[PDB]
């Protein structure tokens, strides 16, 4: 089983831990810390940057990923060809699915906006299928939001 | 106490890793990982850019941390004042210390340059004392010019 992630707290520790500051990549770097201490059972979770109509690699805690991500590939790249959060319960049911990382089983995609265009997204996996469900989706997608207030 | 750390193939497995890269978020972001994956009795591995006359926090694996140092202040602001690495065997000996660290024992800092200029630090932080002798000194700044190489 999962623990329950105490996202009331998460999101108050959020909002105090980058505020007053504006420089993505610190809040970036801060953020991918913050939520890799607060989440039980996950194995990475990083940031992903959009730049010449690919993913670039962003600041994330884990082991060393994959640096260039196109558009529409994978798991990332379908969360900003689409424009939408992808759930994923299991990996290996997404066609196209990139990230032979042994131990990544379910995984979660959610993109961030800046004056309405996507600018990277958040990338969260785990060692388990199912990993994360609507209320995960809900909570996760408000602390982006409290990340892009900063990005404004 | 501390595990040898296995340079001669660390180095390879650097050179590997940013291999082709020249993206420096990206290559710092994965550098920061393989650090942390290879490196015994550390509490935080991450670099800090020289951005508008101060350092500010970059890719890291570990806790948040500060996100602005002013030059010359703590470990890190006196890496780049005094523009050479910095292996400190006990941080609460340093002059004006500048951390909320419990954990923050020891630390090496390596200045990183790019024609001639700092543009940044790498900074590693243990959980004992007297965690980086002269062996890791050499290592770790022959490391950090094999990221200068592809930042160049």
Same mark, same amino acid.
């Given at each position: 089983? +999962? #623990?329950?992630?105490?996202?009331? @707290? /998460?999101?108050?520790?959020?909002?105090? *831990?980058?505020?007053?500051?504006? %420089?993505?990549?610190?809040?970036?770097?801060?953020?991918?810390?913050?939520?890799?201490?607060?989440?039980?059972? +996950? #194995?990475?979770?990083?940031?992903? @940057? /959009?730049?010449?109509?690919?993913?670039? *690699?962003?600041?994330?805690?884990? %082991?060393?990923?994959?640096?260039?991500?196109?558009?529409?590939?994978?798991?990332?790249?379908?969360?900003?060809?689409?424009?939408?959060?992808?759930?994923?319960?299991?990996?290996?049911?997404?066609?196209?699915?990139?990230?032979?990382?042994?131990?990544?089983?379910?995984?979660?995609?959610?993109?961030?906006?800046?004056?309405?265009?996507?600018?990277?997204?958040?990338?969260?996996?785990?060692?388990?299928?199912?990993?994360?469900?609507?209320?995960?989706?809900?909570?996760?997608?408000?602390?982006?939001?409290?990340?892009?207030?900063?990005?404004?």
């Amino acid at each position: 089983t +999962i #623990n329950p992630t105490n996202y009331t @707290l /998460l999101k108050k520790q959020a909002a105090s *831990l980058i505020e007053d500051e504006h %420089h993505m990549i610190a809040i970036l770097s801060n953020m991918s810390a913050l939520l890799n201490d607060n989440l039980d059972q +996950i #194995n990475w979770v990083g940031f992903y @940057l /959009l730049e010449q109509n690919e993913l670039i *690699l962003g600041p994330f805690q884990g %082991h060393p990923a994959c640096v260039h991500i196109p558009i529409g590939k994978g798991v990332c790249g379908t969360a900003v060809s689409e424009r939408r959060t992808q759930v994923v319960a299991d990996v290996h049911q997404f066609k196209g699915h990139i990230a032979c990382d042994a131990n990544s089983k379910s995984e979660i995609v959610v993109p961030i906006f800046k004056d309405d265009k996507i600018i990277g997204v958040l990338d969260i996996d785990a060692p388990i299928t199912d990993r994360f469900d609507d209320n995960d989706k809900e909570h996760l997608e408000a602390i982006v939001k409290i990340i892009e207030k900063q990005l404004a």
